[PDB]
Design an enzyme around this catalytic site. Structure first.
Site, PDB file in Angstrom:
ATOM      1  N   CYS A  95       0.694  -1.275   0.057  1.00  0.00           N
ATOM      2  CA  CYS A  95      -0.142   0.051   0.070  1.00  0.00           C
ATOM      3  C   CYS A  95       0.935   1.347  -0.181  1.00  0.00           C
ATOM      4  O   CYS A  95       0.447   2.445  -0.362  1.00  0.00           O
ATOM      5  CB  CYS A  95      -0.939  -0.137   1.273  1.00  0.00           C
ATOM      6  SG  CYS A  95      -1.969  -1.429   1.416  1.00  0.00           S
ATOM      7  N   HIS A 118      -5.081   7.539   4.453  1.00  0.00           N
ATOM      8  CA  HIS A 118      -5.025   6.249   3.735  1.00  0.00           C
ATOM      9  C   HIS A 118      -6.490   5.751   3.560  1.00  0.00           C
ATOM     10  O   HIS A 118      -7.033   5.008   2.804  1.00  0.00           O
ATOM     11  CB  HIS A 118      -4.231   5.543   4.603  1.00  0.00           C
ATOM     12  CG  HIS A 118      -3.904   4.318   4.111  1.00  0.00           C
ATOM     13  ND1 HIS A 118      -3.383   3.793   2.816  1.00  0.00           N
ATOM     14  CD2 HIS A 118      -3.884   2.851   4.665  1.00  0.00           C
ATOM     15  CE1 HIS A 118      -3.456   2.613   2.584  1.00  0.00           C
ATOM     16  NE2 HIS A 118      -3.656   1.932   3.866  1.00  0.00           N
ATOM     17  N   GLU A 155      -5.421   5.611  12.143  1.00  0.00           N
ATOM     18  CA  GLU A 155      -5.130   6.910  11.401  1.00  0.00           C
ATOM     19  C   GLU A 155      -5.506   7.829  11.921  1.00  0.00           C
ATOM     20  O   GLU A 155      -4.693   9.051  12.457  1.00  0.00           O
ATOM     21  CB  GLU A 155      -5.566   6.834   9.813  1.00  0.00           C
ATOM     22  CG  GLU A 155      -5.340   7.946   8.944  1.00  0.00           C
ATOM     23  CD  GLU A 155      -5.218   7.755   7.565  1.00  0.00           C
ATOM     24  OE1 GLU A 155      -5.868   6.972   6.937  1.00  0.00           O
ATOM     25  OE2 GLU A 155      -4.309   8.356   6.863  1.00  0.00           O
ATOM     26  N   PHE A 167       0.199  -3.073   4.523  1.00  0.00           N
ATOM     27  CA  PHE A 167       0.558  -4.316   4.821  1.00  0.00           C
ATOM     28  C   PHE A 167       2.156  -4.523   5.221  1.00  0.00           C
ATOM     29  O   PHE A 167       2.891  -4.273   4.198  1.00  0.00           O
ATOM     30  CB  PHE A 167       0.054  -5.471   3.972  1.00  0.00           C
ATOM     31  CG  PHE A 167      -1.480  -5.649   4.093  1.00  0.00           C
ATOM     32  CD1 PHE A 167      -2.596  -4.373   3.803  1.00  0.00           C
ATOM     33  CD2 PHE A 167      -2.241  -6.778   4.037  1.00  0.00           C
ATOM     34  CE1 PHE A 167      -3.670  -4.585   3.939  1.00  0.00           C
ATOM     35  CE2 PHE A 167      -3.416  -7.042   3.941  1.00  0.00           C
ATOM     36  CZ  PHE A 167      -4.530  -6.003   4.075  1.00  0.00           C
ATOM     37  N   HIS A 207      -9.360   0.966  -3.154  1.00  0.00           N
ATOM     38  CA  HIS A 207      -7.973   0.823  -2.964  1.00  0.00           C
ATOM     39  C   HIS A 207      -7.115   0.132  -4.061  1.00  0.00           C
ATOM     40  O   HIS A 207      -7.139  -0.823  -4.332  1.00  0.00           O
ATOM     41  CB  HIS A 207      -7.817  -0.166  -1.433  1.00  0.00           C
ATOM     42  CG  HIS A 207      -6.541  -0.021  -1.046  1.00  0.00           C
ATOM     43  ND1 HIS A 207      -5.364   0.363  -1.784  1.00  0.00           N
ATOM     44  CD2 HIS A 207      -6.153  -0.380   0.386  1.00  0.00           C
ATOM     45  CE1 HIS A 207      -4.246   0.141  -0.907  1.00  0.00           C
ATOM     46  NE2 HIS A 207      -4.749  -0.108   0.329  1.00  0.00           N
ATOM     47  N   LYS A 236     -10.206   6.719  -1.426  1.00  0.00           N
ATOM     48  CA  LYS A 236     -10.907   5.526  -1.558  1.00  0.00           C
ATOM     49  C   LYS A 236     -12.161   5.518  -1.387  1.00  0.00           C
ATOM     50  O   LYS A 236     -12.780   4.443  -1.764  1.00  0.00           O
ATOM     51  CB  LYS A 236     -10.104   4.659  -0.564  1.00  0.00           C
ATOM     52  CG  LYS A 236      -8.560   4.638  -0.769  1.00  0.00           C
ATOM     53  CD  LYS A 236      -7.733   3.573   0.105  1.00  0.00           C
ATOM     54  CE  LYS A 236      -6.335   3.362  -0.060  1.00  0.00           C
ATOM     55  NZ  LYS A 236      -5.510   4.572   0.211  1.00  0.00           N
TER      56      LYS A 236
END
Ligand SMILES: [Mg+2]
Lengths: 408, 408
Positions: free
Chosen positions: A161, A301, A312, A396, A338, A333
């Site tokens: 990501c 994100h 976040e 990740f 994503h 997103k």
């Protein structure tokens, strides 16, 4: 060293082909999520995705496409759009001073399925001699360098990501260090396949709201249940300020900060308290030389996950304290899903567009906002002239990459 | 910019586990090439490879090995070996100031094979929830970070054969820019599988001298017929000079230069005259602030390929000219084969050892020199103190990365 500015935006997204189409679509709050058409996903638990609609043959020689995996096809298309948007021509550029750095998270996903199938039905000696060249991650950068003859550094980062932001920040360094004067950087991903959506589905990382595709990706809402996989690519033209002004380039903004950190926590779960994200944002501010209160926008994100979306916000409140309440935060997103390896790149485009145009993109589907996350998530586009903005990417593995943009 | 030195060497190679075992093997001209034992290769046209013999259970917890792909296991072993070799305990450092940067060219190859088979034979809903976390390229860096709690930047480069050098060059920039005071950087690769060896074989990239495993890798010889796939990992401790000096580190050499370029020529075919390779070498020297005349040793990419070896010699002659005849050049691959994504890292370890020990490693199998390639390829270990040395890596895709080391 040298200032580095963004002079070209090549966007290939689920809600628009081209930088301008992408911007208009954002302001409209359009959703790029729909029932999967790329392949028959009837047997899967997740049957929705943010698909891109583009005619590669309209950009590349259809005869060569057959040896190009979809992820490389998207990167080449975005790079062309980027160069076009920047008003450049390979000839008008010193090829030795142009670098390439387009990352990806997975690479040739379709090729992996096609060849692994060949391998099983006919053996290892029937595998295509183009398997390796079509599937490996560095082929997006390589193909762009080959197409235009750019002989400056050609690298590739793969950090899930955080790929798109890591790649852009790494290009930032490349120019600041004098290794190149102009760089096409960003990310590409083409993983809308049976095996990839299947894998993320068995991991329970994806939203299962098949009944309402456009409403599935809903970050910061109380009903958020996992992200939606999107596809596409984002390639930006990074350029030394001097090189840009000397050619009279249109400058969208300046890339002033790059910050990275590691959660060092768990393979797929982000630190619940956003300790890593807080560290990466703090490093982006320090690198750009600005204080928390100088930031007016944060392209989150926010993938629409319970633990992640909260980690976040907690990280933002931690780094911006009293100022967090005055910030504007929105998740791209919500509209395009994503894009994995392309996420950081396309979101950087949206972030640069918000500074340049003076309008902040919205976080759609914010129907049932979560009260525990008391931040302004911009449910509707808003006219605002910010001087500084951050673009977050918390991947990740624990890779955290943050970019800081300054309004020129 | 702070100076950066190499203070720890973690080597996991086909001829030795541990940097010391690897050095003694080098000077003994040992070969790590043998008939494949990892799997039944009887149906393959290439049945040899440079395999590593190590027991991950001696370093990692055997229960967690079930969920770690071989490339990640190798990276952890090398990382552990590097910290021990640097005389460092995870708690003797500021976790926030330690970065991780271990690349790979393919990542979880074994995971891909096992899971693509599950997918094809059992369906996308039978896929393991660990597939994604086990195969993605960035997990080598992530796991090393999670093991020691290093929260500094965590990135991953994937640029084929240039991976090892690119990572180290990137880690160097990391320290020079102050994004970290110490980085565990290098490369890892575990691609000895039916599908990988078969794919490289169909591309005609590998030697087929199955009858004499140890003589197959013979760089710069007339009868060279392709490279031999190797595996393993190289992880080095790059540290800011003052941070190293203050703690009493044992310094092997200083990393002073990093040069990169792109052939921008062909997907798998290296530029015939070594145009990209030459540019990269020139860039590394300029970054190092030195001239061609000052270089005494070059650890060649030298894969043992017909076109490849000649291209490299050609590039060396172009950059060094008359000095090319006084230079000492050797290929570590003659002994350990082509470690692909780990090649540049393990060869950087060899170059550093050559400067630190004042002994130049040889290129074994130099039975039939190629009259066209007439440089000093060091057929026998030779004692000699040199002040500067280069380590080359010119990969598929055209990515060229060169590192320059200085004797301390
Ligand atoms: Mg043969």
């Amino acid at each position: 060293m040298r200032r580095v500015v963004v002079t070209g935006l090549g966007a290939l997204t689920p809600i628009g082909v081209g930088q301008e189409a992408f911007h208009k679509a954002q302001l409209a709050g359009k959703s790029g999520v729909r029932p999967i058409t790329r392949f028959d996903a009837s047997a899967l638990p997740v049957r929705i995705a943010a698909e891109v609609d583009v005619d590669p043959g309209a950009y590349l020689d259809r005869k060569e496409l057959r040896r190009l995996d979809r992820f490389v096809q998207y990167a080449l298309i975005a790079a062309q759009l980027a160069l076009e948007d920047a008003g450049l021509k390979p000839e008008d550029l010193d090829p030795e001073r142009v670098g390439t750095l387009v990352g990806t998270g997975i690479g040739g996903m379709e090729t992996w399925e096609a060849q692994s199938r060949v391998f099983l039905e006919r053996g290892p000696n029937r595998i295509s001699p183009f398997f390796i060249p079509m599937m490996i991650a560095n082929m997006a950068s390589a193909h762009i360098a080959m197409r235009y003859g750019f002989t400056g550094p050609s690298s590739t980062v793969v950090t899930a990501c955080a790929t798109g932001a890591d790649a852009l920040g790494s290009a930032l360094r490349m120019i600041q260090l004098g290794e190149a004067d102009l760089v096409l950087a960003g990310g590409t991903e083409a993983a809308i396949t049976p095996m990839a959506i299947g894998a993320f589905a068995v991991m329970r990382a994806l939203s299962t709201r098949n009944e309402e595709p456009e409403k599935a990706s809903r970050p910061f809402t109380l009903s958020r249940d996992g992200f939606v996989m999107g596809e596409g690519a984002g390639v930006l033209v990074l350029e030394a300020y001097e090189h840009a002004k000397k050619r009279g380039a249109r400058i969208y903004a300046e890339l002033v900060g790059f910050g990275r950190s590691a959660d060092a926590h768990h393979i797929t779960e982000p630190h619940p308290e956003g300790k890593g994200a807080a560290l990466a944002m703090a490093r982006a501010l320090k690198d750009a030389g600005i204080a928390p209160e100088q930031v007016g926008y944060i392209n989150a994100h926010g993938t629409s996950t319970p633990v992640g979306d909260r980690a976040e916000v907690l990280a933002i409140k931690r780094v911006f304290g009293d100022h967090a309440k005055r910030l504007m935060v929105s998740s791209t997103k919500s509209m395009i899903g994503h894009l994995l390896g392309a996420a950081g790149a396309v979101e950087a485009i949206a972030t640069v567009q918000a500074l340049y145009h003076g309008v902040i993109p919205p976080t759609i589907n914010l129907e049932d906002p979560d009260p525990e996350l008391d931040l302004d998530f911009v449910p509707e586009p808003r006219e605002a002239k910010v001087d500084y903005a951050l673009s977050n990417s918390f991947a990740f593995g624990g890779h955290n990459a943050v970019l800081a943009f300054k309004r020129v």
